[PDB]
Structure 1
């Protein structure tokens, strides 16, 4: 059910990991900076996400997070269906690749406005979610979910 479907995505910058959750139907994102991708960090990130949005399904970003018992436990706790992230639709690869490139571009555009990478990443999340393509991703997610509630 597409209002509740999210995709995890892991990218790297400045020797750190940027963990991203994408709301598939809207393109809305949440993101955080962590030193390395672990099951515990991924689990915590998903717990945060599901407290904020009605997360029904998460397509994990790799096999390690799919396998992780801690991630499975977080998904159990938060009522999330944990699924693999095999791109059965080949367009998905491209969309995520394109998103990572866009995010890194925005981070470069703001990078001197903050000392810490985490701040620049949150500026990039802000800009991404507010950009009108006409609706923004932030508007699209709210509309999609509200329509589903009604």
Structure 2
């Protein structure tokens, strides 16, 4: 459970935003990419797994599940690749709502950043620091620390 992440791909300004969500905490990392290819997803997962202990990833769609480059990255990083089928249906809505929320933050920072990629990183910052009272950043650290001990 502390090692479970969910991939989520959303769109804005004819551009692609790739998000990884730490399921137990709501903590995220995100990137703007030209298009959602196997290669982009594979590279994104390698980066994520070098930064946090990623044990299982619920992939966002079947093309990434199938991709040989994604499978190579998951093998390299010791990640168990699983589907992202919301057997628990409330998953779809939670993801959808987060995409709403992130797009809203992006809109709020648009006067400050010239480029979408910058606004996305500002949105990651705001999301992970937001007190909901604990923040996502605080929850992921405690969950993983408790897991180690």
TM tier relative to shorter chain: over 0.9
TM-score (norm 1): 0.99
3-state DSSP of counterpart to 1:6: strand
Separation in structure 1 between the aligned mates of residue 110 and residue 80 of structure 2, nearest angstrom: 36
Separation in structure 2 between the aligned mates of residue 98 and residue 83 of structure 1, nearest angstrom: 22
Residue pairs, 1:1-150, within 5 angstroms = 2-150=1-149
Q: CA deviation at 1:28?
A: 0.2
CA offsets, 1:4-53, max 9 Å, x none? 00000000011110000000000000000001000000000000000000
CA offsets, 1:83-106, max 9 Å, x none? 001000000000000000000000
3-state DSSP of counterpart to 1:47: helix
Separation in structure 2 between the aligned mates of residue 111 and residue 94 of structure 1, nearest angstrom: 26
Higher helix share: 1
TM-score (norm 2): 0.99
Unaligned runs of 5+ in 2: none
Unaligned runs of 5+ in 1: none
Q: What is the RMSD of the two structures over their aligned residues, measured on CA atoms? A: 0.3
Q: How many residues align?
A: 149
3-state DSSP of counterpart to 1:54: coil
3-state DSSP of counterpart to 1:111: coil
